[PDB]
Amino acid sequence: AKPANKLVIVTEKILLKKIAKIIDESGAKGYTVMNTGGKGSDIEANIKFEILTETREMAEEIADRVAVKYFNDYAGIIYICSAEVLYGHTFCGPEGCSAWS
Amino acid sequence: AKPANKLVIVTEKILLKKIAKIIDESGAKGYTVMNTGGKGIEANIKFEILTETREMAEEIADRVAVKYFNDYAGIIYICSAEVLYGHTFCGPEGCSAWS
Amino acid sequence: AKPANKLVIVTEKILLKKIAKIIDESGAKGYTVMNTGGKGDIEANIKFEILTETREMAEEIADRVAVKYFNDYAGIIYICSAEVLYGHTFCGPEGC
Numbered sequence: 450a451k452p453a454n455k456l457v458i459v460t461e462k463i464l465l466k467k468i469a470k471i472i473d474e475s476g477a478k479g480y481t482v483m484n485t486g487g488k489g490s491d492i493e494a495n496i497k498f499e500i501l502t503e504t505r506e507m508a509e510e511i512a513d514r515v516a517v518k519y520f521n522d523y524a525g526i527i528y529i530c531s532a533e534v535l536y537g538h539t540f541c542g543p544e545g546c547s548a549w550s
Numbered sequence: 551a552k553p554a555n556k557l558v559i560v561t562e563k564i565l566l567k568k569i570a571k572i573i574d575e576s577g578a579k580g581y582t583v584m585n586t587g588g589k590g591i592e593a594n595i596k597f598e599i600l601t602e603t604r605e606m607a608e609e610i611a612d613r614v615a616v617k618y619f620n621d622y623a624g625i626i627y628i629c630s631a632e633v634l635y636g637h638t639f640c641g642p643e644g645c646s647a648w649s
Numbered sequence: 650a651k652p653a654n655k656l657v658i659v660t661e662k663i664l665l666k667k668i669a670k671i672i673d674e675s676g677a678k679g680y681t682v683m684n685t686g687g688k689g690d691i692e693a694n695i696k697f698e699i700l701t702e703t704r705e706m707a708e709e710i711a712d713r714v715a716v717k718y719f720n721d722y723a724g725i726i727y728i729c730s731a732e733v734l735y736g737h738t739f740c741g742p743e744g745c
């Protein structure tokens with residue numbers, strides 16, 4: 450297994466394209482996105498991104514960039530969870546996530 | 551970053567309003583909720599609530615489980631999380647950027 | 650609270666039933682599944698979340714999925730630590 454930061458961005462659904470381009474520009478190998486309801490009926494349409502990154506620094510770069518650009522004007526939260534990747538074509542590399550020395 | 555518990559509640563879809571009410575009264579600052587499928591394929595909902603303290607997450611869990619989970623299907627779990635940004639969650643003092 | 654492993658499988662929509670069958674055959678007590686988008690242009694996929702009591706049960710599911718499918722289909726499998734606070738089946742009759 451390969452350690453990973455699971456970066457989660459939940460924000461207003463209109464920022465989808467802007468945030469995807471920030472993720473693409475970061476070096477992250479990919480991302481998962483989904484529609485969600487958020488309260489912060491009072492529920493509104495949100496989007497949640499989940500981005501597994503190899504380093505804490507890459508996660509922080511993405512978080513920082515989204516927040517500095519958008520979080521004055523739009524509701525959102527960004528957090529990280531620890532994760533381990535077991536299988537992942539691009540995340541772990543050709544030798545997979547359980548490489549030996 | 552500010553330590554948080556990510557409280558997850560997966561349950562029957564018909565409980566959405568009832569559980570949102572509990573989360574609202576808890577002092578939690580917000581929540582996410584989404585339609586999901588599940589087997590325990592049924593129509594489910596999943597709530598995600600970040601809480602500042604483990605006690606808040608446990609009180610919400612306790613309230614929901616006692617009120618509904620002997621009569622309806624449901625699972626409640628927590629993940630550790632660190633909040634980097636969150637205007638309401640971290641408040642004015644920010645997400646302790648240098649802690 | 651009862652420690653748990655949260656196994657997450659993101660993969661192609663067509664494998665929904667096939668992966669569900671593998672999760673069940675593993676002894677896992679349940680799973681959640683949802684429609685997602687991903688890049689890895691955004692395309693439609695699915696995400697499974699499976700809480701397991703043991704790490705080996707999570708890796709058994711993971712191994713069986715990846716060997717059977719990840720040469721031919723897009724996907725990622727990862728695990729997060731979790732604790733279950735309430736669950737009928739996960740914790741048994743005496744609760745978590």
Ligand SMILES: Nc1ncnc2c1ncn2[C@@H]1O[C@H](COP(=O)(O)O)[C@@H](O)[C@H]1O
Binds near residue numbers: 460495635
């Ligand atoms: N404590 C929280 N737990 C979960 N989601 C939250 C929380 N606070 C805010 N959010 C999410 O992010 C938005 C709130 O943004 P903000 O008020 O700028 O933190 C809402 O749409 C929620 O979906």
Ligand SMILES: Nc1ncnc2c1ncn2[C@@H]1O[C@H](COP(=O)(O)O)[C@@H](O)[C@H]1O
Binds near residue numbers: 561622624677680681
């Ligand atoms: N072991 C598990 N892993 C992930 N989700 C679960 C698990 N057990 C139950 N669930 C979810 O919670 C719902 C209610 O569970 P249950 O009360 O066991 O029928 C299910 O329909 C699933 O979506």
Ligand SMILES: Nc1ncnc2c1ncn2[C@@H]1O[C@H](COP(=O)(O)O)[C@@H](O)[C@H]1O
Binds near residue numbers: 499722
């Ligand atoms: N680093 C990552 N973080 C989050 N999700 C990912 C990542 N890499 C891949 N995925 C998800 O897994 C799916 C298939 O990935 P791939 O097989 O690598 O193209 C993508 O469409 C994403 O939903």
